[PDB]
Write a protein that binds this ligand. Structure first.
Ligand SMILES: Nc1ncnc2c1ncn2[C@@H]1O[C@H](COP(=O)(O)OP(=O)(O)O)[C@@H](O)[C@H]1O
Ligand SMILES: Nc1ncnc2c1ncn2[C@@H]1O[C@H](COP(=O)(O)OP(=O)(O)O)[C@@H](O)[C@H]1O
Ligand SMILES: Nc1ncnc2c1ncn2[C@@H]1O[C@H](COP(=O)(O)OP(=O)(O)O)[C@@H](O)[C@H]1O
Ligand SMILES: Nc1ncnc2c1ncn2[C@@H]1O[C@H](COP(=O)(O)OP(=O)(O)O)[C@@H](O)[C@H]1O
Ligand SMILES: Nc1ncnc2c1ncn2[C@@H]1O[C@H](COP(=O)(O)OP(=O)(O)O)[C@@H](O)[C@H]1O
Ligand SMILES: Nc1ncnc2c1ncn2[C@@H]1O[C@H](COP(=O)(O)OP(=O)(O)O)[C@@H](O)[C@H]1O
Ligand code: BEF
Ligand code: BEF
Ligand code: BEF
Ligand code: BEF
Lengths: 531, 48, 508, 401
């Protein structure tokens, strides 16, 4: 069995359902002494994976009343009048032994909106449920509850005072709301003494009711896998970090990202940009009590508008594996559709899912194709293309709560972005990444390679003082051409070097074919702002 | 530059009803169908 | 029994339903010698639990007759033709004990339209009820009662002459009708000497009657939950001096007034962000002009009737982005007594054919079921698109969804004091038929704040702050010339971000 | 019957699915007194043609336990009911007589997303599939196994811990996973020893296991049609011609003549193209020895009539990588949502080849440098250039494209 101590998380939502299915049954002398009769059951809803389908298991044992289970599509049969007679013979079955409770699991299947359907038995099974809850006289002491995940596809007459009183929301847990979650999913298990449950709750954001229950299962499965080489075992927070790699995506399974990482040391030169991007995402997560003490919302939106080649479109790849936050990647116009429809909903279902996995860091790459709103229709650009921006303007600020959603934008043309997005609240941190100078390029050449013997005795400072006016990935071409000539002097008959010893002779012809990508005329369009 | 919404329709289901009952075929097995033009049925007796 | 006293309000519609159930039964000789008796059928439509399922329970106890009840799809069974026979024997059961009174409930499964059904037994049950309702013409017959929502989905053959020609609407109580609801529902309860029953009905404006019972239930539970001293769990009796009654105070009804959540907009609940009319500081003449045009038709609806003029409704917001005009709509989310409905641009647009125009027709009906309310349309450029020059660029009839919004702003009926608020940054791409006083009266323009306005802007954001020894904010106002309201939020956020950074560096 | 050796050809994803259903049965005493229930639902996905319909039959002989099997749309019959009860008949039969293994197939057609379809049967099939996987203390004996190629089309509530977790990715086997497929369906065939089999491991790369079984079946029909006995290389070399992997069947290119001798004079250009696509394919260990990423391809520009449509024809017939030709602005379309996914699935098939090379002729038409600075033409179609901008380097990792 399970009890009320075996369910953690929403303690405030636990008490409002405990005073309604137990307190009118255990304490019946308050309602007849003062006040109206006790009301009927509530409609549980929320995101999938929370404990809406395991809360009703606790009230089936400790209450002691007669429990009847009615699933959603279980009361269904091909006859004309047994799809509703099986529904009404179970509610009167609970009336034989008062008091009794009835759980309607997945009420969205057998109760849609009646105006959307036409010519089915499903408009009859909902009208049977109308006269079954609050009929003429057939309601004495039974309390019927339900659980679903889509409260919008329910008929509004079913959420009236007679049938469903309150819409209790089992929501996403927070800090010290997901800490007692891991304590009860680790009570019966044999654990060691080096495990710290408080540190695991801080690095789990989208883990709500079952992904955090997947974390105690995958770490225990890894402990079984290493023990295959009677005997007692125990986790030691090594498999917990191994299970922390892929255990988040319940809601964000459609937008997973894998698996490139630069581990914060493959980039160089941008020492001020690396610290500015770090404290904009670590401050609302690591110290959330400092912002509530000051009473001010933090800054979220950052935008990159540098010239092509400096390191903006994979600086988001640096924060995708370093900070402890959910990462959502949008590669250009990868969400557009042609249906007068889903192209607008693709922004809508990507933000509330990100708001459900709060906190998170989303990434919008190449916003030149997204933010074309102020010109339309420009002959062949196509009309009705400004609605994809106005939906984006209602998700960054809109009318919503602050869910610590950080928006990272990377683009190469700063003049083709909508200036309605260019405002605080949506995109306030406007940083311009320049070309590397002679100081940044020496920290760029050694940080790019990081894994190769470099013929100790050479000097990379001569390359940094030379090849001026070059981008960061322009220097990637030089070390790739030098490695191209290094293996060109090694693929011959070895019967030559049995060592990856790249020398200066491979760097001689690499500087000959090294060309500048960003022209001088294209450079002045970025220096024309000077804000 | 071109947009089309959709057209709707498609899926519908049906219900089926049953036949008569248990006790109609209990009484349908106990009756007669008739004499085709001219036959007899039974005229016998036994045990002395 | 429920009797005459249990029905709350609805007095103009109670007098219609009394004369057709009492006077043929009380005075059967009155209808003689003046012709035949007209009323033999009735249909109550509207919202389902506003007093239509209670009216059938009312006449069962205040009109003594051989009463029985007909549910929804309970006449269906696994037989051949029994579905059209058990309701035939139900009507014959009412006539063999004549005089009697008959009530049928929820005729959506019993009598749908004949063109929606396709070759099943449901199209014969509506034909069976159509024949037996008017063919049964004896003396002192039974009178049918139908209490069903969605009256437009009924077959028009059920209203010819004799099935029912006396259909009535149980209307929504707007003013001084919900007070008669609260006098009856709190009569069985022993109220404490703190509540004001006139103030509970005058603050809110749109209920359905059934949610008024939802107001007193949550107010009764919060007084018990506040006085929940649980010391003796096994003895489970809360007295603390004597067997007594706790009652309910005025503060318990104010808590239930916060999370009211009426049934008309239960699927359109807004995120309750706290506002106290002080998050905006720079706007001092456009904020109070906004409050007087949304309170005067709803708080005092007597001066507009005395003058005989139409109330003012409809306001558009336009200007540069970053200075209010959508977060002013945040200020009227929880502060005004009217309910709020938010639209985040093309969030109600759908991909189906007739669903995009139907998702905009019913939110206005949810605004119509909820008596006077305010709605909000953010980024009207995503909706309008100037109604000119499609040329295939619209594609999926993007100018035809606008024409549904043409007829809903001015309305074909009388207006029920609804308020539409549009917020955008560009007034040139809006169609000029939106800018007419039948739909949007005035087009107010929020300007960039000057030095006198932006000084009180920084005072608005620095409300709940653990401040340092104070510095002058007029020097920051005279230096940040020509910035929007959101631009000054960035400066106080950057100054606060440096206040978090040195605090961690001070620790260890 | 098939088994664990007949399914051999994957190693890392094989041990994840084997210990999920055999280790709680062969050794049940270690889960007991451990506090955690075993995982209860397998969901294997990947590209089509891999052994997601033949993995379930493979451990549907070696465990020796009570196998089952449900097809995709045969459970959907026209009754008001019984589309959910035939699902119940397949689970309540599988409840008794522990242990239990049940395999459900085609979960992409049936059980779709809830708010993305409009069909009243589809609202009841999704939740009856949920309720039999977690009801009122359900999930006590059965272990469900799913198999699909579209994991994004299924319901988002279906991939929870209680019903479908520890999902395993069955990808394209090329790093010594392709060679293990050859040694399975050739030990039953008669092979005359005249060649080695290791040279065939690097000839084509877009083969997904099922295309390898079509490669050895093409050599079987070529062997019997010339003897009109064993097998030889000449049937396999004829099978190496018109190879046509199943992921690249929509775009074919093998229709040109023999090349690499029709060009001359630009030998430093001909050797340069050999230095950029043959080096990581033939010597992949030298790039990881230096620890650097390989170089990208070659852009051609010059006078018309020089040979730059012949240099594309030279690499299409000589190197071992796959070739995808784009006939100018071929992928540009009239639809708004298309010409963004139409440029995406070419690059999605390019990363699924691992490796390959694609060709984009007349880059003036597909780039159209910046529509923001373009006002005299009036095009302003910057969507097709930005999606191309984030598909080559982009956000995803490199797979030697
Ligand atoms: N208090 C809780 N906190 C977190 N997860 C919980 C809690 N109680 C149960 N669960 C998890 O919920 C799952 C069972 O219920 P669930 O699937 O969430 O039901 P439903 O989907 O119907 O709401 C299991 O994975 C269980 O570990
Ligand atoms: N010094 C460098 N710093 C960062 N990225 C570099 C550097 N040298 C080469 N690169 C690589 O070059 C590519 C360009 O990065 P970025 O400037 O963000 O994109 P873009 O090429 O679109 O301007 C990335 O893959 C990046 O890792
Ligand atoms: N006069 C009244 N004013 C307001 N609410 C009422 C009134 N009479 C009954 N109710 C409420 O209506 C509910 C019962 O009828 P209801 O559910 O409204 O019926 P129906 O939905 O069939 O119209 C109860 O919540 C009751 O408190
Ligand atoms: N003086 C001010 N008046 C109103 N809002 C202000 C003021 N100072 C800062 N703000 C804040 O700045 C933000 C501006 O948002 P808003 O102007 O509604 O967005 P938009 O630019 O999309 O119209 C809001 O969060 C608002 O509370
Ligand atoms: N390990 C394997 N490597 C390559 N091909 C395999 C392997 N196992 C089975 N196959 C092939 O897969 C086919 C049967 O399964 P398949 O059709 O791929 O299933 P599904 O399409 O459901 O994933 C046969 O052609 C068989 O030869
Ligand atoms: N010397 C040559 N080298 C390469 N191609 C040649 C040569 N002489 C003729 N051709 C042929 O002429 C055509 C032009 O080749 P290419 O320069 O690539 O295209 P284009 O004519 O568009 O410039 C091809 O069919 C090519 O095979
Ligand atoms: F099982 Be739960 F309703 F997602
Ligand atoms: F009277 Be209600 F429609 F059940
Ligand atoms: F929300 Be505002 F209209 F940008
Ligand atoms: F290839 Be499928 F799994 F049948």
């Amino acid at each position: 069995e399970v009890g009320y101590d075996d369910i953690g998380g929403c303690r405030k939502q636990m008490a409002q359902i405990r005073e309604m299915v137990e307190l009118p049954l255990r304490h019946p002398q308050l309602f007849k002494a003062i006040g109206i009769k006790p009301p009927r059951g509530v409609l549980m809803y929320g995101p999938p994976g929370t404990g809406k389908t395991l809360m009703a298991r606790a009230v089936a044992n400790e209450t002691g009343a007669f429990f009847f289970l009615i699933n959603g599509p279980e009361v269904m049969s091909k006859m004309a009048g047994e799809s509703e007679s099986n529904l009404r013979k179970a509610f009167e079955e609970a009336e034989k032994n008062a008091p009794a409770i009835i759980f309607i699991d997945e009420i969205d299947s057998i109760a849609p909106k009646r105006d959307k359907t036409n010519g089915e038995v499903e408009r009859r099974v909902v009208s049977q449920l109308l006269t079954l809850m609050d009929g003429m006289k057939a309601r004495s002491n039974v309390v019927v509850i339900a659980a679903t995940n889509r409260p919008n596809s329910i008929d509004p007459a079913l959420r009236r005072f007679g049938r469903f009183d309150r819409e209790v929301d089992i929501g996403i847990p927070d800090a010290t709301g997901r800490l007692e979650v891991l304590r009860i999913h680790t009570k019966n298990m044999k654990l060691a003494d080096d495990v710290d449950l408080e540190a695991l709750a801080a690095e789990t954001h989208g883990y709500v009711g079952a992904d955090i229950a997947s974390l105690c299962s995958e770490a225990a499965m890894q402990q079984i896998r290493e023990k295959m080489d009677l005997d007692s075992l125990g986790v030691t927070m090594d498999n917990f970090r191994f299970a922390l790699g892929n255990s988040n995506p319940s809601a964000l399974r459609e937008t997973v990202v894998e698996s490139v990482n630069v581990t914060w040391d493959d980039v160089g030169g941008l020492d001020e940009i690396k610290e500015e991007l770090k404290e904009t995402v670590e401050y609302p997560v690591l110290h959330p009590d400092q912002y509530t003490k000051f009473g001010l919302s933090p800054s979220k939106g950052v935008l990159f508008y540098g010239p092509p080649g400096t390191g903006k479109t994979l600086l988001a790849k640096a924060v995708a594996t370093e900070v402890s936050a959910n990462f959502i990647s949008v590669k250009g116009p990868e969400l557009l559709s042609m249906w007068y429809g889903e192209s607008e909903s693709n922004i809508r279902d990507i933000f509330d899912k990100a708001r459900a996995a709060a906190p998170t860091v989303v990434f919008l790459d190449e916003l030149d194709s997204i933010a074309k709103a102020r010109g339309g229709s420009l002959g062949d650009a196509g009309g009705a293309s400004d609605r994809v921006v106005n939906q984006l303007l209602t998700e960054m600020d809109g009318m919503n709560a602050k869910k610590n959603v950080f928006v990272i934008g990377a683009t190469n043309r700063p003049d083709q972005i909508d200036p309605a997005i260019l405002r605080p609240g949506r995109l306030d941190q406007l940083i311009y990444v320049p070309l590397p100078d002679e100081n940044a390029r020496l920290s760029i050449l050694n940080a790019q390679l990081r894994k190769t013997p470099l013929e100790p005795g050479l000097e990379l400072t001569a390359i940094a003082k030379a090849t001026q006016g070059f981008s960061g990935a322009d220097l990637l071409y030089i070390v790739q051409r030098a490695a191209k000539y290094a293996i060109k002097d090694s693929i011959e008959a070895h019967r030559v070097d049995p060592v990856p010893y790249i020398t200066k002779e491979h760097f001689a012809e690499a500087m000959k074919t090294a060309k500048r990508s960003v022209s001088d005329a294209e450079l002045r369009r970025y220096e024309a702002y000077s804000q | 530059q071109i947009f089309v919404k959709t057209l709707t329709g498609k899926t519908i289901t049906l219900e089926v009803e049953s036949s008569d009952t248990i006790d109609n075929v209990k009484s349908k097995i106990q009756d007669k169908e008739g004499i085709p033009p001219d036959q007899q049925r039974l005229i016998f007796a036994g045990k002395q | 029994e429920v009797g005459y006293d249990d029905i709350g309000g609805c007095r103009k519609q109670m007098a219609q339903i009394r004369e057709m159930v009492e006077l043929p039964l009380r005075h059967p000789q009155l209808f003689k010698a003046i012709g035949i008796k007209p009323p033999r059928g009735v249909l109550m439509y509207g919202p389902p639990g506003t007093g239509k399922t209670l009216m059938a329970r009312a006449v069962a106890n205040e009109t003594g007759a051989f009463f029985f009840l007909i549910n929804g799809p309970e006449v269906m069974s696994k037989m051949a033709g029994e579905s059209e026979s058990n309701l035939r024997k139900a009507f014959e059961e009412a006539e063999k004990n004549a005089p009697a009174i008959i009530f049928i409930d929820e005729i959506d499964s019993i009598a749908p339209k004949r063109d929606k059904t396709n070759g099943e037994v449901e199209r014969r049950v509506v034909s069976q009820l159509l024949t037996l309702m008017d063919g049964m013409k004896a003396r002192s017959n039974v009178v049918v009662i139908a209490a069903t929502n969605r009256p437009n989905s009924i077959d028009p053959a059920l209203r010819r002459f004799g099935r029912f020609d006396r259909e009535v609407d149980i209307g929504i109580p707007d003013a001084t009708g919900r007070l008669e609801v609260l006098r009856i529902h709190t009569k069985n309860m022993k109220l404490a000497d703190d509540v004001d029953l006139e103030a509970l009905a005058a603050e809110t404006h749109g209920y359905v009657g059934a949610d008024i019972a939802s107001l007193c239930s949550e107010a009764a539970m919060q007084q018990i939950r506040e006085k929940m001293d649980l010391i003796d769990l096994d003895e489970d009796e809360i007295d603390a001096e004597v067997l007594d009654s706790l009652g309910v105070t005025m503060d318990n009804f104010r808590f239930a007034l916060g999370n009211s959540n009426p049934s008309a907009l239960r699927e359109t609940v807004v995120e309750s962000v706290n506002v106290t009319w002080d998050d905006v500081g720079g706007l001092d003449e456009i904020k109070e002009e906004l409050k007087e045009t949304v309170e005067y038709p709803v708080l005092h609806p007597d001066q507009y009737t005395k003058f005989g003029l139409s109330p003012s409704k409809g306001v558009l917001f336009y200007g540069p982005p970053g200075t209010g005009k959508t977060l002013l709509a945040k200020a009227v989310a929880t502060e005004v007594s009217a309910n709020f409905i938010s639209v985040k641009g093309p969030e109600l647009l759908s991909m189906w054919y007739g669903e995009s125009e139907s998702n905009i027709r019913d939110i206005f009906d949810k605004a119509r079921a909820a008596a006077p309310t305010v709605v909000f349309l953010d980024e009207l450029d995503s909706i309008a698109k100037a109604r000119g020059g499609s040329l295939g660029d619209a594609g999926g009839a993007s100018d035809r969804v606008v024409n549904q919004l043409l007829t809903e702003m001015d309305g074909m009926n009388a207006k029920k004091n609804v308020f539409v608020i549009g917020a955008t940054n560009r007034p040139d791409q809006i169609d000029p038929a939106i800018l007419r006083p039948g739909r949007l009266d005035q087009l107010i323009y929020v300007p960039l704040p000057d030095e006198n306005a932006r000084l009180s802007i920084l005072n608005a954001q620095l409300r709940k702050t653990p401040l340092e020894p104070g510095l002058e904010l007029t020097a920051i106002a005279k230096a940040t010339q020509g910035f929007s309201g959101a631009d000054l939020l960035y400066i106080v956020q950057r100054a606060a971000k440096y206040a978090i950074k040195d605090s961690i560096e001070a620790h260890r």
